[PDB]
Design an enzyme around this catalytic site. Structure first.
Site, PDB file in Angstrom:
ATOM      1  CG  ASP A   1     -41.317  -1.579  -7.142  1.00  0.00           C
ATOM      2  OD1 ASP A   1     -41.958  -2.286  -6.328  1.00  0.00           O
ATOM      3  OD2 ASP A   1     -41.325  -1.875  -8.357  1.00  0.00           O
TER       4      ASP A   1
ATOM      5  CD  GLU B   1     -33.501 -23.187  -7.105  1.00  0.00           C
ATOM      6  OE1 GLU B   1     -32.928 -23.727  -8.086  1.00  0.00           O
ATOM      7  OE2 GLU B   1     -34.660 -23.596  -6.660  1.00  0.00           O
TER       8      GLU B   1
ATOM      9  N   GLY C   1     -38.295 -10.069 -16.920  1.00  0.00           N
ATOM     10  CA  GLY C   1     -37.027 -10.762 -17.068  1.00  0.00           C
ATOM     11  C   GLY C   1     -36.383 -10.844 -15.703  1.00  0.00           C
TER      12      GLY C   1
ATOM     13  CG  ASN D   1     -32.969 -25.922 -14.345  1.00  0.00           C
ATOM     14  OD1 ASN D   1     -34.175 -25.875 -14.008  1.00  0.00           O
ATOM     15  ND2 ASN D   1     -32.567 -26.286 -15.539  1.00  0.00           N
TER      16      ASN D   1
ATOM     17  CG  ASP E   1     -34.578  -3.455 -20.585  1.00  0.00           C
ATOM     18  OD1 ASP E   1     -35.626  -2.802 -20.826  1.00  0.00           O
ATOM     19  OD2 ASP E   1     -33.817  -3.053 -19.668  1.00  0.00           O
ATOM     20  CB  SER E   2     -33.903  -6.873 -16.787  1.00  0.00           C
ATOM     21  OG  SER E   2     -33.716  -5.644 -16.079  1.00  0.00           O
TER      22      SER E   2
ATOM     23  CG  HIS F   1     -43.738  -4.862  -8.982  1.00  0.00           C
ATOM     24  ND1 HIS F   1     -42.597  -4.080  -8.995  1.00  0.00           N
ATOM     25  CD2 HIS F   1     -43.544  -5.921  -9.787  1.00  0.00           C
ATOM     26  CE1 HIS F   1     -41.661  -4.688  -9.818  1.00  0.00           C
ATOM     27  NE2 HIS F   1     -42.257  -5.836 -10.316  1.00  0.00           N
TER      28      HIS F   1
ATOM     29  CB  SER G   1     -40.560  -8.237 -11.231  1.00  0.00           C
ATOM     30  OG  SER G   1     -41.184  -7.655 -12.381  1.00  0.00           O
ATOM     31  N   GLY G   2     -37.973  -7.538  -9.322  1.00  0.00           N
ATOM     32  CA  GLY G   2     -37.478  -7.692  -7.968  1.00  0.00           C
ATOM     33  C   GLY G   2     -35.999  -8.033  -7.907  1.00  0.00           C
TER      34      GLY G   2
HETATM   35 CA    CA Z   1     -32.673 -25.825  -8.789  1.00  0.00          CA
END
Ligand code: CA
Length: 223
Positions: A84, A52, A175, A54, A171-172, A40, A177-178
């Site tokens: 999915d 990463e 928050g 930030n 929960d996620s 999705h 997806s994937g």
């Molecule tokens: Ca960054």
């Protein structure tokens, strides 16, 4: 991620951000050239952002690579969110280091009550809208299938599991997806769905990666 904490910069070295002018989904780095995410999360013109913390500031450790190819699972049903899972090939190989690492595929499925780590960037609020710029983490057990299917009657398949707390709060959902769900050093899950966010008797629902390891290895080696 609702009801967790700040992971710490570069503490989840396999964590990927999928960017299309903005951060829209998470993923996991499984080798220098491949990412696994949710089906999705399919878009065109994805850039994969490694190293990463930030997502709004360039803190030095990043690697920004265009995706060359996306492969959605042949049996993905976008209505039921069954199967999915999606594979994303990098245009150029990532450079692996302390901050940018692969995560292993399972040799076996995880059992209920196994503690896992769920990470991501998304919405921290169960009610309202608040998007964090830094990576957040949640530790949560895999719930028993009984407890999962009871919360979503007739919605849960073999290719899904639930994790978190039956009381809600943590929960996620939106928050990220994937995003990854890592248990005992292996990639066991992908953040797929969940009704509302961190609601009482509404756990998160994850793509059960151990069902797919043969598909992943065959696809990657042929593409
Ligand atoms: Ca960054």
């Amino acid at each position: 991620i609702v009801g967790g904490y700040t992971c710490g910069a570069n503490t989840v070295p396999y964590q990927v951000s999928l960017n299309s002018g903005y951060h829209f989904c998470g993923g996991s780095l499984i080798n220098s050239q491949w990412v696994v995410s949710a089906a999705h999360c399919y878009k065109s013109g994805i850039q994969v952002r490694l190293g990463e913390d930030n997502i709004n500031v360039v803190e030095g450790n990043e690697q920004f690579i265009s995706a060359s190819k996306s492969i959605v699972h042949p049996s993905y049903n976008s209505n039921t969110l069954n199967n999915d899972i999606m594979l994303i090939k990098l245009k150029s190989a990532a450079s692996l280091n302390s901050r940018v690492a692969s995560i292993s595929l399972p040799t076996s499925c995880a059992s209920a009550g196994t503690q896992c780590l769920i990470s991501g960037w998304g919405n921290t609020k169960s009610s309202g809208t608040s998007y964090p710029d830094v990576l957040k983490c949640l530790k949560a057990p895999i719930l028993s299938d009984s407890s999962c299917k009871s919360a979503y009657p007739g919605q849960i398949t073999s290719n899904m599991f639930c994790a978190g707390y039956l009381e809600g709060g943590k929960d996620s959902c939106q928050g990220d997806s994937g995003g990854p769900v890592v248990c005992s050093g292996k990639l066991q899950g992908i953040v797929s769905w969940g009704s509302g966010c961190a609601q009482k008797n509404k756990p998160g629902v994850y793509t059960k990666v151990c069902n797919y390891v043969s598909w992943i290895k065959q696809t990657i080696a042929s593409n």
